[PDB]
Amino acid sequence: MIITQVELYKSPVKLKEPFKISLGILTHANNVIVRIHTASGHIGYGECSPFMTIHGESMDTAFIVGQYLAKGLIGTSCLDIVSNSLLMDAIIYGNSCIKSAFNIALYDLAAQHAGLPLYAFLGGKKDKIIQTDYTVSIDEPHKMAADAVQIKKNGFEIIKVKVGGSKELDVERIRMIREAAGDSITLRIDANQGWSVETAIETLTLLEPYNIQHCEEPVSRNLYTALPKIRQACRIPIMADESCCNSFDAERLIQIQACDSFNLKLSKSAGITNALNIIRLAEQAHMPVQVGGFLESRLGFTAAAHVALVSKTICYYDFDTPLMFEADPVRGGIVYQQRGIIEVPETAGLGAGYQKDYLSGLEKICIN
Numbered sequence: 001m002i003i004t005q006v007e008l009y010k011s012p013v014k015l016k017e018p019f020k021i022s023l024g025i026l027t028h029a030n031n032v033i034v035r036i037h038t039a040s041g042h043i044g045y046g047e048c049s050p051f052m053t054i055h056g057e058s059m060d061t062a063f064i065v066g067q068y069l070a071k072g073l074i075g076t077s078c079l080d081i082v083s084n085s086l087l088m089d090a091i092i093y094g095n096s097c098i099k100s101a102f103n104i105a106l107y108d109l110a111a112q113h114a115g116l117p118l119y120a121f122l123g124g125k126k127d128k129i130i131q132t133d134y135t136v137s138i139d140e141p142h143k144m145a146a147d148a149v150q151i152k153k154n155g156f157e158i159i160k161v162k163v164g165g166s167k168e169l170d171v172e173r174i175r176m177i178r179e180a181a182g183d184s185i186t187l188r189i190d191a192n193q194g195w196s197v198e199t200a201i202e203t204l205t206l207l208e209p210y211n212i213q214h215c216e217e218p219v220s221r222n223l224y225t226a227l228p229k230i231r232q233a234c235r236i237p238i239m240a241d242e243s244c245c246n247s248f249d250a251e252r253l254i255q256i257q258a259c260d261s262f263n264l265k266l267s268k269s270a271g272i273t274n275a276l277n278i279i280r281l282a283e284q285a286h287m288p289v290q291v292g293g294f295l296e297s298r299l300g301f302t303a304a305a306h307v308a309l310v311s312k313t314i315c316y317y318d319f320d321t322p323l324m325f326e327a328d329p330v331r332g333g334i335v336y337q338q339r340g341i342i343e344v345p346e347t348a349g350l351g352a353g354y355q356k357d358y359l360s361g362l363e364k365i366c367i368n
């Protein structure tokens with residue numbers, strides 16, 4: 001089925017509370033939306049959420065590069081996913097974030113064509129419960145404990161805590177939380193490259209008593225070679241996030257035994273196609289995978305959720321940010337139930353789209 005036009009949209013939605021990590025503070029989710037049209041009149045949706053300090057892309061750059069990409073895709077068969085992913089790579093290096101949106105949309109169309117929901121089109125099955133955590137922003141420790149409480153009250157059974165400050169402060173943070181919210185509630189932490197190799201090892205051993213599930217990206221992605229040293233000198237398991245973007249990164253990390261688990265994100269792998277490779281590797285190496293994201297709406301996370309059902313090695317889920325939006329512009333897609341349990345669409349394709357004339361109010365361009 002030939003691709004006849006693609007539309008790109010700037011989708012900036014404000015967050016209720018500012019979102020805070022060791023790398024910076026965000027007030028908005030500044031996403032880019034992608035709609036691919038076929039001659040047969042099918043429409044595929046993709047979304048991406050550029051994060052400047054990690055992707056090295058922005059809503060502004062994504063909106064431009066996306067046009068380069070659309071141009072090259074016009075006239076091609078939306079079913080040749082691999083061919084088209086290569087085509088995009090030939091147009092521009094990197095820019096995985098925006099590429100992922102195109103990729104996701106292509107799979108949407110592919111699943112639609114097959115008359116299956118994405119998860120089934122990928123060979124997955126609904127044989128496990130998807131339960132999301134919820135994220136406490138890095139802040140003054142009292143604030144952080146307060147939030148942790150509210151979160152527990154709202155019924156979430158898994159908390160993800162943003163650390164990455166001084167060793168002293170991060171420990172005060174986890175303690176105040178643990179003593180203000182309980183020892184039964186499972187909690188995981190994320191440094192976003194915040195610590196030095198030194199500070200990491202010291203803080204991670206000082207934190208072990210508080211029973212934490214795993215720690216995401218404790219040090220600079222540039223120092224991934226120091227990960228194996230940290231993995232061995234620290235009980236708590238460490239999960240590679242920024243350090244694991246594509247399948248090559250994954251293989252390299254496995255090779256030097258850098259970490260215990262991965263955090264898989266479709267933006268980092270430039271779409272579903274390569275995410276599948278990372279998953280395979282994680283399987284062969286008996287490594288648990290957490291699927292997560294950035295500030296995608298429920299449309300983006302619906303794609304993540306479909307992919308989450310592809311392999312039993314995936315068993316942790318971080319799909320919370322859409323709940324932080326002032327307003328939900330998505331039509332269909334994953335639904336959040338109590339306890340943070342996620343339910344995946346069963347209709348053909350992605351199983352999500354955007355609310356009527358939400359799109360029409362957006363700054364947009366259209367590639368013929």
Ligand SMILES: [Mg+2]
Pocket residue numbers: 190192216217241242263
């Ligand atoms: Mg992370």
